[PDB]
């Protein structure tokens, strides 16, 4: 009970090192991604998007969940560096065609029934 | 009246060839070279 | 076995597989948890996840097993189990003209050792298991999605993944590219409740709760 | 002894000039490695049994073709390869120690089907 | 039993070596390949003159769907929904209500012909021979919407092809 | 000669379609000038051979 | 009923694309051999299990 | 089948076979497209007596797997007897 | 292959995706005269492989 | 029978028609509304009632195995005619 087999990191301190290593790889890659794919975004927008993705999981405290997130993040990086992804796949992080949905109670009330 | 299905003929079907069949044709190598050399000599003459 | 509509039993193979099942459990007691043979003569060895490399190596190399072919490797998702995933190895022995099934288990976070060292065929089967179920295989030469689209989020073959997914693609003329948007169906898939409220097979009746 | 076969019929499986002498070496090496496994391990008892049976046939049949009919393992070159695999397996069973008791029983309903 | 496909030892007598030498230098086995395609040039082609000629079909052919009537003109379909339950693609949508005369009939009978896999399971499951796959297969359209058949379109198909549909069922219903 | 019969059999396709005008009509509408046996004609004008 | 028919299994020697082409062409010949036996041994009776 | 004798000779010679014997285009040797109606037979279970379903119920004879071992000088065995070696074909051993 | 698609079409109604073989047997019995047509197709197919 | 609504659109045998203000009528502009003119409710009503001498009659729809499952209709009531639930043909017992 509570004794589990690890993936890569035996504790959060070790896991956070892999998070920082992954962040440095993504940070150095955005200039190349915005160049090869000929994206109409800036290097600042891309690096802001990377930061947005990392802060989205800043509340994790289980090292194994962090290990999978780094594993999944490295697969994403490998797909982008080798240009397995297309321009359509790299722009799906920006949701350019999705109309902004309401956030406040009143706006959600007027348009439909969803919470 | 009686059962009627799709069945083989009473005596069965005839033999069906399946084995490879590549018949031998042409002349021997000796004759082929003899004809070609004879053509040259007449051509040269 | 004279009944036209009923499948005849082969009790010679049933004894042979039962005998060999004990044989494996005697040689690998550290890993073998349960052995069984089905009524259609298929032997199953249920092992601890730690025994993936020892068990498969024995079954491939032992002179009385010689299971040189990995017929297939797949996972089954059973949410009600503490370990929801069930890794299934189907091996074939050409020397003895026999088949054996090796089964283990894991969950969302526990890795399972990669069997590429034992069977080169497991390279893509483990990529498919990871891609479609999210089961991580440790020490895999290169693990990544094999079937799903690039950037696809989630694991489709999990029982809690919806049939139509969460996103769908179209072409948008404003951005001049194919985009991904939340799924809306013109006709919703119609769920049919087909189960009959009367028990079909008394032989499999589970003890009352 | 018999005439030497020109081919085994299997691609990449070279003919063996001395099938008997090579088999006697491999089986003897297997029985030496099995001496390091505890006397009561079922792997040792079973593997020594079958190895001795094949070793006796190799010593009691000088003709290769007649030896193959007794070993029932295909070409004599296949039998040598299986001896090499068994020897490699025994060297690895020592490290794994499968004869030890079960590492851990499964949860209560892990192998219960249907659910 | 097995056989070898490429386990043969060539002869080494001087006449066999010369024969292979002539084949290498005079391209005999390539000239032989030319002779096989020359033969086809002088055979009658297998092409048919479509649309003036049609490829042969059979009474079991599974083509466009149709809803049939009894000889009196009453619809055969009685809204049992067996076709809807067995349709692998869920291409059939049905609604039903008691008709003005109290008859069990449908108010909606739609087949999305772009979901359908033309498998015939619906006509197998129909207990009144109401929904059938007809012999028509030349019904391509210039727009997607034209392939979403409703009840009116399916009754029109049945009334159009009934003469042929009835004769095909007459030719194959004893096998069913 | 079977050679002559071929040429003769090709000259009878012109006559079997009603002359040159009929022969050319079926050569350009259907790209085929075979002569067949009239099995029947439907109410829309289609003729089946 | 594959144990009631007679046919030969082609076997290659080189393991290359040419031996696998010969195996496939020779398997087509063996399929004609089986079809001959299925056309003559076809028995009468029902075509689906008589269990409704 | 409408080829003149000369063209038949030319195409038979160019291929080395007698093509006319085995033409790849079908002719009146095919079955008639209209056939007499069938009268198919019935299965072994079409009986009026001695035909209770519990005596031929295949699904209800299936059983759960029989547990051989569970964690909840004996001779060695293999999964089955070693496979007998195939015999070279006598129809055509070498292609 | 076109002629062997007619055998598919004459037993199931579809040239390719017959859905003919099912658990329990097949879906319908062979129509009368089919086996005669399979014999005629098979009698010549060996020559087709020889040309190949 | 086929009848037209006041705006001119035809009414189907199910009683479906678009109201004068429904925007969905735009789909029929430049095209036509497919309607089957052989209303089955009218055609079945045109069939004569069959007189029979027995209290119970069977209908398979005609054509044997090409009809519908054979059902048995009770003709004891004199006020109304027994109707086949499958094909709508009516039967009446002769002189009750
Ligand atoms: C090079 C020389 C070629 C010779 C011309 C071809 C020829 O006449 O072959 C006849 C004849 C037909 O051969 P086939 O393949 O058996 O024809 C199938 C049926 O028998 C016969 O087939 P069928 O039943 O269809 O016969 C009817 C057909 C037969 O029509 C013919 O007469 C054949 C075409 C000849 C013109 O009628 C037509 O379709 C006529 C319209 C098509 C004419 C197209 C060719 C026109 C010439 C183009 C060049 C113009 C300048 O071939 C021979 O017997 C040997 C020809 C070689 C020797 C020719 C010189 C001596
Ligand atoms: C007696 C006195 C002594 C001297 C007498 C000498 C007389 C004989 C003179 C020698 C004859 C040489 C003939 C030419 C040989 C050249 C070809 C060759 O090198 O063969 C080996 C080559 C290669 O053969 P290979 O692939 O098997 O390899 C040969 C070498 N080994 C085996 C060691 C690897 O063959 C070819 O050239 C293949 C041809 C390519 C395919 C072309 C399509 C075929 C077209 C056929 C129609 C041709 C119509 C031509 C006529 C046109 C008219 C305008
Ligand atoms: C169109 C009008 C019709 C006539 C058109 C000409 C058709 C010619 C091509 C078809 C030939 C028939 C096929 C055939 O018999 O070949 C098999 C035969 C036999 O094939 P083979 O490979 O089995 O050889 C058998 C004999 N051994 C093995 C000993 C060599 O091939 C030949 O013999 C052709 C030899 C001719 C060589 C010509 C090459 C030199 C060309 C010089 C310039 C001219
Ligand atoms: C390309 C054009 C060449 C076409 C050559 C024709 C081949 C041919 O006709 O051979 C087929 C014929 C088959 O008959 P047969 O030999 O009896 O078969 C049984 C044998 N076991 O057998 C024959 O009739 C043999 C006829 C061809 C003999 C070979 C011809 C000489 C080839 C070598 C010389 C090449 C140089 C010639 C110079 C050309 C100058 C114009
Ligand atoms: C007879 C036909 C005459 C017309 C042909 C004209 C074309 C000539 C080009 C083709 C070459 C054929 C001429 C060579 C001689 C052939 C006759 C011959 O060799 O004698 C027959 C004899 C029987 O052969 P066998 O005993 O069964 O086995 C061989 C064992 N040495 O074989 C022997 O045992 C004798 C020794 C055989 C070895 C001699 C070397 C032969 C190879 C040298 C290259 C020949 C080609 C050179 C020319 C190339 C240009 C074409
Ligand atoms: C460089 C080539 C020289 C010719 C080029 C110019 C061609 C004329 C094109 C402009 C005039 C239009 C002519 C109409 C096209 C010809 C085909 C045709 O339409 O046939 C129509 C006519 C039958 O009409 P009909 O059925 O009676 O009326 C309708 C009844 N419901 O049946 C007829 O055909 C009437 C006869 C006069 C028209 C004949 C067209 C001849 C076309 C060239 C014939 C070449 C044939 C040989 C081909 C080469 C073979 C080696
Ligand atoms: C060149 C001009 C065209 C050739 C002239 C027409 C050939 C003479 C008429 C004819 O067809 O008889 C030739 C005869 C073919 O008859 P055959 O097929 O062998 O036997 C009857 C089977 N029903 O036998 C022959 O075909 C003789 C071989 C043809 C002559 C050589 C042509 C080489 C080109
Ligand atoms: C411009 C003018 C060029 C003419 C060329 C003349 C060449 C003369 C040299 C001798 C040729 C020779 O010997 O060839 C004559 C040949 C040989 O036939 P065989 O002895 O019966 O066959 C011998 C045994 N086989 C049947 C196995 C081959 O016959 C032909 O079928 C040649 C037809 C061309
Ligand atoms: S043919 Fe098959 S897929 Fe199409 S509507 Fe009928 S049951 Fe559905
Ligand atoms: S078409 Fe046939 S199966 Fe479908 S609802 Fe109507 S009666 Fe039932
Ligand atoms: Zn009725």
Swiss-Prot record, chain A:
Topological relation to the membrane, as annotated: Peripheral membrane protein
GO cellular component, as recorded: mitochondrial inner membrane; mitochondrion; respiratory chain complex I
Keyword terms, alphabetized: Acetylation, Electron transport, Membrane, Mitochondrion, Mitochondrion inner membrane, Respiratory chain, Transport
Intracellular or extracellular location(s): Mitochondrion inner membrane
Principal cellular location given in the protein's record: mitochondrion
CDD domains: Complex1_LYR_NDUFA6_LYRM6
Keyword check for Acetylation: yes
GO annotation terms (biological process): mitochondrial respiratory chain complex I assembly
PANTHER family, A to Z: NADH DEHYDROGENASE [UBIQUINONE] 1 ALPHA SUBCOMPLEX SUBUNIT 6, NADH-UBIQUINONE OXIDOREDUCTASE B14 SUBUNIT
Sequence similarity: Belongs to the complex I LYR family.
Role of this protein: Accessory subunit of the mitochondrial membrane respiratory chain NADH dehydrogenase (Complex I), that is believed to be not involved in catalysis. Required for proper complex I assembly. Complex I functions in the transfer of electrons from NADH to the respiratory chain. The immediate electron acceptor for the enzyme is believed to be ubiquinone.
Self-association and partners: Mammalian complex I is composed of 45 different subunits.
Protein name as it appears in the record: NADH dehydrogenase [ubiquinone] 1 alpha subcomplex subunit 6
Native organism: Bos taurus
Classification of source organism: Eukaryota, Metazoa, Chordata, Craniata, Vertebrata
Curated annotation (Swiss-Prot), chain E:
GO CC list: mitochondrial inner membrane; respiratory chain complex I
Recorded topology in the membrane: Peripheral membrane protein
Residues reported to bind [4Fe-4S] cluster 1: 77, 80, 83, 126
Catalytic activity line of the entry: a ubiquinone + NADH + 5 H(+)(in) = a ubiquinol + NAD(+) + 4 H(+)(out)
Annotated GO MF terms: 4 iron, 4 sulfur cluster binding; metal ion binding; NADH dehydrogenase (ubiquinone) activity
EC number from the UniProt entry: 7.1.1.2
Domain of life of the source: Eukaryota
Cofactor(s) this protein requires: [4Fe-4S] cluster
Record's keyword terms, sorted: 4Fe-4S, Electron transport, Iron, Iron-sulfur, Membrane, Metal-binding, Mitochondrion, Mitochondrion inner membrane, NAD, Oxidoreductase, Repeat, Respiratory chain, Transit peptide, Translocase, Transport, Ubiquinone
4Fe-4S ferredoxin-type domain sequence ranges: 68-97, 107-136
Binding site residues for [4Fe-4S] cluster 2: 87, 116, 119, 122
Subcellular compartments: Mitochondrion inner membrane
GO biological process: mitochondrial electron transport, NADH to ubiquinone; mitochondrial respiratory chain complex I assembly
Cofactor binding, note field: Binds 2 [4Fe-4S] clusters per subunit.
Family the UniProt entry places it in: Belongs to the complex I 23 kDa subunit family.
General function of this protein: Core subunit of the mitochondrial membrane respiratory chain NADH dehydrogenase (Complex I) which catalyzes electron transfer from NADH through the respiratory chain, using ubiquinone as an electron acceptor. Essential for the catalytic activity and assembly of complex I.
Quaternary organization: Core subunit of respiratory chain NADH dehydrogenase (Complex I) which is composed of 45 different subunits. This is a component of the iron-sulfur (IP) fragment of the enzyme. Interacts with RAB5IF.
Organism the protein comes from: Bos taurus
From Swiss-Prot, chain F:
Highest taxon in the source lineage: Eukaryota
Subcellular location: Mitochondrion inner membrane
Chain positions found as N-acetylmethionine: 1
Function summary: Accessory subunit of the mitochondrial membrane respiratory chain NADH dehydrogenase (Complex I), that is believed not to be involved in catalysis. Complex I functions in the transfer of electrons from NADH to the respiratory chain. The immediate electron acceptor for the enzyme is believed to be ubiquinone.
Similarity remark: Belongs to the complex I NDUFA12 subunit family.
Subunit (UniProt): Complex I is composed of 45 different subunits.
Name this polypeptide is given: NADH dehydrogenase [ubiquinone] 1 alpha subcomplex subunit 12
Lineage: Eukaryota, Metazoa, Chordata, Craniata, Vertebrata
Full-protein positions shown: 1 to 49 of 145
UniProtKB/Swiss-Prot annotation, chain J:
Highest taxon above the source species: Eukaryota
UniProt keyword terms in alphabetical order: Electron transport, Membrane, Mitochondrion, Mitochondrion inner membrane, Respiratory chain, Transit peptide, Transport
Main location: mitochondrion
Topological relation to the membrane, as annotated: Peripheral membrane protein
Location relative to the cell: Mitochondrion inner membrane
Keyword Protein transport included in the entry's annotation: no
GO biological process assignments: mitochondrial electron transport, NADH to ubiquinone
A GO CC annotation given for this chain: mitochondrial inner membrane
Function: Accessory subunit of the mitochondrial membrane respiratory chain NADH dehydrogenase (Complex I), that is believed not to be involved in catalysis. Complex I functions in the transfer of electrons from NADH to the respiratory chain. The immediate electron acceptor for the enzyme is believed to be ubiquinone.
Subunit record text: Mammalian complex I is composed of 45 different subunits. This is a component of the iron-sulfur (IP) fragment of the enzyme.
Family membership noted in the UniProt record: Belongs to the complex I NDUFS6 subunit family.
The protein's name: NADH dehydrogenase [ubiquinone] iron-sulfur protein 6, mitochondrial
């Amino acid at each position: 009970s509570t004794s589990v087999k690890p993936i890569f990191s035996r504790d959060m301190n070790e896991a956070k090192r892999r998070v920082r290593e992954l962040y440095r790889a993504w940070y150095r890659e955005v200039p190349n991604t915005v160049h090869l794919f000929q994206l109409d975004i800036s290097v600042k927008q891309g690096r802001d998007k990377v930061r947005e993705m990392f802060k989205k999981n800043a509340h994790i405290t289980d090292p194994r969940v962090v290990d999978l997130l780094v594993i999944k993040g490295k697969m994403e990086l490998e797909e982008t560096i080798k240009v397995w992804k297309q321009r359509t796949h790299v722009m799906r992080f920006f949701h350019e065609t999705e109309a902004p949905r309401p956030k406040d109670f009143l706006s959600k009330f007027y348009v439909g029934h969803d919470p | 009246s009686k059962v009627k299905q799709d069945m083989p003929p009473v005596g069965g079907y005839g033999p069906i060839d399946y084995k490879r069949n590549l018949p031998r044709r042409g002349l021997s190598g000796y004759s082929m070279f003899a004809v070609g050399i004879g053509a040259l000599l007449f051509g040269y003459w | 076995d004279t009944r036209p509509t009923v499948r005849p039993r082969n009790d010679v193979a049933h004894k042979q597989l039962s005998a060999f099942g004990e044989y494996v459990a005697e040689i690998l007691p550290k890993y073998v948890q349960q052995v069984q043979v089905s009524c259609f003569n298929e032997l199953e060895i249920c092992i601890h996840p730690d025994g993936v490399i020892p068990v498969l190596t024995f079954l491939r190399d032992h002179s009385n097993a010689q299971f040189k072919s990995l017929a297939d490797l797949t996972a089954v998702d059973i949410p009600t189990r503490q370990n929801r995933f069930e890794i299934v190895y189907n091996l074939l022995s050409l020397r003895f003209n026999s088949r054996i099934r090796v089964k283990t288990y894991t969950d969302e976070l526990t890795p399972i050792e990669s069997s590429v060292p034992v069977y080169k065929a497991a390279n893509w089967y483990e990529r498919e298991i990871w891609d479609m179920f999210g089961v991580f295989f440790a020490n895999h030469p290169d693990l990544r999605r094999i079937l799903t689209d690039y950037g696809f989020e989630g694991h489709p073959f999990r029982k809690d993944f919806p049939l139509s997914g969460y996103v769908e693609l179209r072409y948008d003329d404003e951005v001049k590219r194919v985009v991904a948007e939340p799924v809306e169906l013109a006709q919703e898939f119609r769920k049919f409740d087909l189960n009959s409220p009367w028990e079909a097979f008394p032989a499999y009746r589970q003890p009352p709760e | 002894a018999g005439l030497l076969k020109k081919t085994t019929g299997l691609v990449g499986l070279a003919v063996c000039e001395t099938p008997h002498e090579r088999l006697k070496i491999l089986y003897t090496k297997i029985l030496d490695v099995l001496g390091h496994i505890p006397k009561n391990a079922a792997y040792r008892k079973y593997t020594e049994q079958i190895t001795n049976e094949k070793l006796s046939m190799v010593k009691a049949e000088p003709d290769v073709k007649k030896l193959e009919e007794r070993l029932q393992g295909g070409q004599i070159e296949e039998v040598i390869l299986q001896a090499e695999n068994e020897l490699s397996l025994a060297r690895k069973m020592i490290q794994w120690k499968p004869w030890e008791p079960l590492v851990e029983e499964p949860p209560a309903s892990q192998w219960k089907w249907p659910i | 039993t097995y056989k070898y496909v490429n386990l043969r030892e060539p002869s080494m007598d001087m006449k066999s070596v010369t024969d292979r030498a002539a084949q290498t230098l005079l391209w005999t086995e390539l000239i032989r390949g030319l002779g096989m395609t020359l033969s086809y040039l002088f055979r009658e082609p297998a092409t048919i003159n479509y649309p003036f000629e049609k490829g042969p079909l059979s009474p079991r052919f599974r083509g466009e769907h149709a809803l049939r009537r009894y000889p009196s003109g009453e619809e055969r379909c009685i809204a049992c929904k067996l076709c809807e339950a067995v349709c692998p693609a869920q291409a059939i949508t049905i609604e039903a209500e008691p008709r003005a005369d109290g008859s069990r009939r449908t108010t909606r009978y739609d087949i999305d012909m772009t979901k359908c896999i033309y498998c015939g399971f619906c006509q197998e499951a129909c207990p009144v021979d109401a929904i059938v796959e007809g012999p028509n297969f030349e019904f391509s359209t210039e727009t997607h919407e034209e392939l979403l058949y409703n009840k009116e379109k399916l009754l029109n198909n049945g009334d159009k092809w009934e003469a042929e549909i009835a004769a095909n069922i007459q030719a194959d219903y004893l096998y069913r | 000669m079977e050679l002559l019969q071929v040429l003769k059999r090709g000259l009878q396709q012109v006559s079997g379609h009603g002359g040159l005008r009929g022969y050319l009509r079926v050569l350009f509408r259907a790209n085929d000038v075979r002569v067949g046996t009239l099995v029947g004609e439907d109410k829309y004008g289609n003729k089946y051979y | 009923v594959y144990d009631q028919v007679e046919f030969d299994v082609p076997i290659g020697s080189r393991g290359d694309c040419y031996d696998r082409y010969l195996c496939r062409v020779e398997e087509m010949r063996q399929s004609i051999r089986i079809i001959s036996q299925c056309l003559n041994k076809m028995p009468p009776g029902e075509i689906k299990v008589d269990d409704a | 089948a409408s080829a003149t004798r000369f063209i038949q000779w030319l195409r038979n010679w160019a291929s080395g076979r007698d093509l006319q014997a085995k033409l790849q285009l079908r002719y009146q040797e095919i079955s008639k497209r209209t056939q007499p109606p069938p009268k198919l037979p019935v299965g072994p279970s079409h009986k009026l007596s001695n035909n209770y379903y519990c005596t031929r119920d295949g699904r209800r004879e299936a059983m759960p797997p029989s547990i051989v071992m569970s964690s909840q000088e004996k001779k060695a065995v293999s999964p089955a007897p070693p496979i007998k070696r195939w015999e070279l074909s006598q129809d055509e051993p070498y292609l | 292959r076109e002629k062997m698609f007619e055998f598919y079409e004459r037993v199931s109604g579809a040239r390719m995706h017959a859905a003919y073989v099912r658990p329990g047997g097949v879906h319908q019995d062979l129509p009368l005269g089919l086996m005669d047509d399979i014999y005629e197709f098979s009698k010549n197919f060996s020559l087709r492989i020889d040309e190949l | 029978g086929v009848r037209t609504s006041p705006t001119g659109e035809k009414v189907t045998h199910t009683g479906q028609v678009y109201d004068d203000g429904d925007y969905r009528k735009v789909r029929f502009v430049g095209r036509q509304k497919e309607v089957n003119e052989n209303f089955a409710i009218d055609l079945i009503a045109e069939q004569p009632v069959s007189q029979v001498g027995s209290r119970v009659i069977s209908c398979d729809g005609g054509g044997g195995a090409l009809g519908h499952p054979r059902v048995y209709i009770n003709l004891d009531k004199e006020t109304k005619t027994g109707t086949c639930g499958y094909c709508g043909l009516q039967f009446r017992q002769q002189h009750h």
